[PDB]
Amino acid sequence: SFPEEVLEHVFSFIQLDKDRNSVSLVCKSWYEIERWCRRKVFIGNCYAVSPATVIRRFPKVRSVELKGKPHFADFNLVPDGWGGYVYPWIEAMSSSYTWLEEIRLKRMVVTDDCLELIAKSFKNFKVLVLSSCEGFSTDGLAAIAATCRNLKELDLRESDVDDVSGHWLSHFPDTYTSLVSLNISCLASEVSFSALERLVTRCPNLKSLKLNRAVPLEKLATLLQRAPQLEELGTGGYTAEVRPDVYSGLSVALSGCKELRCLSGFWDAVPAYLPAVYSVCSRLTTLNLSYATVQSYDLVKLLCQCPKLQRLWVLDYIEDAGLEVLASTCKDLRELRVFPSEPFVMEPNVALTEQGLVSVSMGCPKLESVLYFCRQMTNAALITIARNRPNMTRFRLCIIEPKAPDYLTLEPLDIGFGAIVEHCKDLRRLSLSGLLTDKVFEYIGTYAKKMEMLSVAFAGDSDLGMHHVLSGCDSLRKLEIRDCPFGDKALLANASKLETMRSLWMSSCSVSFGACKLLGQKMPKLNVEVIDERGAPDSRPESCPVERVFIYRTVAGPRFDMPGFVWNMDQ
């Protein structure tokens, strides 16, 4: 029996999406009060709902987050033109959300028209995050720079930009001072260094500056002198002739940066200049050495200086020896990602094996997130990892050769991964690889009750495997599968499960056109999309497997923007 204004005020302290959703369901009164004051909307699948529906329901939104293409798009498994256009969302928001402040997009197609419309529609615009987006150029960036007088964040994380000219950055006016975060690390084109230096100088609240490779190491100290308050730094190029003056200038500048907690960049890092960063390392919590091609011993020297490290991304050049030192020194490590230096060569180029991961699992008590690329694995290693780290929440293990068995026993890795799902009760994400039979999927279905996202490739024997997962994985939200003998039977037998999930991706599997049509008939609230570049699917027998199928629940119905190689199985 609270006045409307009182309930509006209670709700202002409730900002989690799930809480807001639950509030909207208590009664009709709360539905209407909640919707008029919801500040942020998170749309994990842009096709699960229409812009018009969001804008009508939530008229006062100031922050929108939208995700487009599925994750396997990252590996070239989604053909160009599939979809994910943000323009319809911007067009719709442009007339309704006059007060919009934040747009965060992931795997969407964003054009210069989209960026021009944002700049001219949203006067209070403050945050633009484009993560793995494509479709725009520096001309669109120039429109944002010129017009968005209140801009605080421009983050282009792993996007593909048409690099027409670095001059866009010169369009930030002299009166513009509000920048807090700038990430231009994906841009090929060199910006005007004088423009950049003037920008950094006049932006006192700048806390995160992630440069592109085109800012050479010899110019880095100059920028750092202008921004000693930085909390995150992404270097530009990290190579120069080896000289005492350059080194000492870089050393002095970096040691003047007392608040740095996150360091990245390091393109073409030369071991000679890495010590400049040591003074910073005592307090670092994130270190991204993914692009540094330096050898194990050089990495060890740096990591020895990093006792507070919480997140490390490194190349397999670290080696087993380097990871043993890591396990000794970084007792607060929460996340480790070890990427392949030569992912496309079969013979190992580094001494990085299963032992490195065992070493860290034993030595790092808070380690709960791993992505690890290696060339060999054993069940014994996986069992020791599982037993050492029952607190693991995300475990992603890529053995580079498809279907590689345990190298010591030649057995499938079923029991190794079965130990992970058995022992790590709060595991929310799993990707597994190596030789795997239906038995591993039986373990997953029995034990992995909190798993939300599963990625599978070249695995299993029959439809039983997918059936165990769909039948047993209570928390499953996203399942993505490639090159597995799974098909019609498991999919149709578990069709209602699909309404409980964001999406299911299956490519190069055994799913027939016939089963896709039937699934589409049966489940009209699913969009069942066959994505196949061989032309019309009924030019082939109904029994013929489709190249890919992507299935997702939606309240919007079939898509209006499918290309010629996508068909929806509804009527």
Binding site: F75, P343, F373
Partner: peptide
């Protein structure tokens, strides 16, 4: 090779 395997963003060699 296999398309999109290993699952990395790296340009091929």
């Amino acid at each position: 090779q296999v398309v999109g395997w290993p699952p990395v963003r790296n340009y091929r060699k």
